[PDB]
Hints:
The structure is a homotetramer. By secondary structure, chain A is an all-alpha fold. Chain A has one domain: Tetracycline Repressor, domain 2. Chain A contains nine helices and no strands.
Amino acid sequence: DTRQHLLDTGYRIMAVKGFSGVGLNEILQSAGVPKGSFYHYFKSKEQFGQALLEDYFRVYLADMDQRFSAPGLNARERLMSYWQKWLDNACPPCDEQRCLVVKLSAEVADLSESMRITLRDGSDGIIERLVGCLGQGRDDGSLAPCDARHMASALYQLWLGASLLSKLHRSPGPLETAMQTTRSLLE
Amino acid sequence: SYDDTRQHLLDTGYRIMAVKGFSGVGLNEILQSAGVPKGSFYHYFKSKEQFGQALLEDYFRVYLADMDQRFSAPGLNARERLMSYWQKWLDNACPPCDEQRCLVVKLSAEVADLSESMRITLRDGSDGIIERLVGCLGQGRDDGSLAPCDARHMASALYQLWLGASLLSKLHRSPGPLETAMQTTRSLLE
Amino acid sequence: SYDDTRQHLLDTGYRIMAVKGFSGVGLNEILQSAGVPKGSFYHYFKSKEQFGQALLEDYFRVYLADMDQRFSAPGLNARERLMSYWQKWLDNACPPCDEQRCLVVKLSAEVADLSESMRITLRDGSDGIIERLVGCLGQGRDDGSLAPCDARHMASALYQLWLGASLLSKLHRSPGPLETAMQTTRSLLE
Amino acid sequence: DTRQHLLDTGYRIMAVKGFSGVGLNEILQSAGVPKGSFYHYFKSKEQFGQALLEDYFRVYLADMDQRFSAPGLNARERLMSYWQKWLDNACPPCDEQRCLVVKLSAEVADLSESMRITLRDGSDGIIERLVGCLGQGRDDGSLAPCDARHMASALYQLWLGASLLSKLHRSPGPLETAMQTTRSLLE
DNA sequence: GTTTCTAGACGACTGGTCTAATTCA
DNA sequence: TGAATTAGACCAGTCGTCTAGAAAC
């Protein structure tokens, strides 16, 4: 409820303004919660950051699992559905960024050990799901053989970099480059 | 000597922003570290934003310049020139270097939604990186050192790859993800 | 166990306020340190202020009870009783003790301008101390242990003297000014 | 000037409300100075406190020096004019304290090592001037022999506690008691 | 002429108080 | 169901920093 409302409002604003660039008041005002309530549920802005990041990964990873077990698609189709979504809902009429790994990693990495680790574990979990799907495709013939752990990492790295350049250009341009390199890397 | 101070401010901003970012450093810490009075900031820059722009502009001028020198080393072919760049990237990331070298990695996501001027500086700067890469790629298609490719796509895909690698490398305080980028780079070339 | 919790809050309030004052301590620290939730506070007191008053009243309750004990102690004459009170004040302010014991010294100046009720409690409390001194001085005029004097005047002067000594002792972290007082006390009483 | 206005205003408010019981905003608003100017001159509230106490003692001892050098009075007359002033300006509409040694000592001694020191040195500065006057009277026949350092210390202690009891009673009653004991201790 | 100083919104966080309803009798 | 206990709402308060611009030696 109130805690969850704060987490949501936080995610919504930090996705755009970052961690250091928002103040508790803006989050608070935008959510209609008093400062004393904020500090009833979180001991600090840092601890709040972590919570929002954990909740973010729980939700993100749930979706990845659902996606990589969708009925009626083979593994390749499942894997590509993920990259396509990344490319699709990132045409740049979208300012409110979806991806906290892209938005917060570099800022937060030297600032909060708890947020650094949460981002770190969260990304590893993302990579983990990719490894499974890559593996599933080696079972159903959808995908060529490869070192699934290496491939998932390299692809994920490639798409992360694309998102940076994408934000830098306000173009989905670099993501198209990513998609294309991905098709090339698989098969 | 006015100019000298100003560069020192710019130099200090780089040392510090590389770690704390743009929103996380204040004018006072920068001025203090550089031996400049607090009251003097606007003697050298119009705003913190324009300071940033200046900070970044100098960063790329020096960077693109080293890239040019690097892509002209006597005794190396195009492939050896290209490989030394990516190699440098892996090396000077002995594993927990939180003292970022790379402002493209450190500042892009933060600054892009915040400052239109810095965003463009970052965008044009990074395009400049890719451009020099394309040139080395082409240089290799000419001297046979590197297989053929769509040069603008390969550099763009490779540069994207190391950027994402760098992020994960900061998240892990390990050079592991970069070692991964290196493997993929070799596979994508030759 | 409701009464015990109340008493425990009172005691914890005393230990901490003796050191941090009234305005410098917060409800949360007192409550947390006592194992009572902050939300339960108003189940035990009407306001921070009345907690303060309660705190002080209980302090004087215990304090004046000692004074009564001491000043009726079997086998000591009146001078001996009176001097044992002053001796303990001197003794228990050796400087391993930076935690004030005495609320009249710690709180009077702070609280007097701030809370009419705490002021009153302190006032009535201090008066009771003076009253017992008076009683002991008189007791000595009865049994020959102490010279004749204006007892209400003397008890007041002595108490004022030691109050000021306690202040300077805190400022110096030494029992020095207290030794001074003790000497002036012997001089005045003889 | 701006610095001095801050120092003066702090004195007027801290004399009444103590140290921990005032906030910068009350001092600042009351004085018409912005937070940014305050922190240009003082790095912290604690250091402001120290600054304040130092200026207080500078002024107080300057005054003691003139009063104890008054034309036409001998040492007894000078010494008693000090004790008298203490009593006089504690007619009881005077709840706005003049005296920081009475007001701040117990509060600040456990809280700020620098403010404790300034209070301590300043109190010593007071006692020194009393010792000198007591000494001057042993020279001009105005005052009986005594251990001057012992007596000034006992007198100052006596008036310190009496000042405490006045605040507690809202009466100059306890100060008269001291004045009387003072006369008995001298003579 | 530039650094001293003005400026006050803003930063994260704590203050004391009080209500609504849980939990316990 | 009534009485005991407290989570949580609430926000003006705390001290201190932020970028920015003006004043002034």
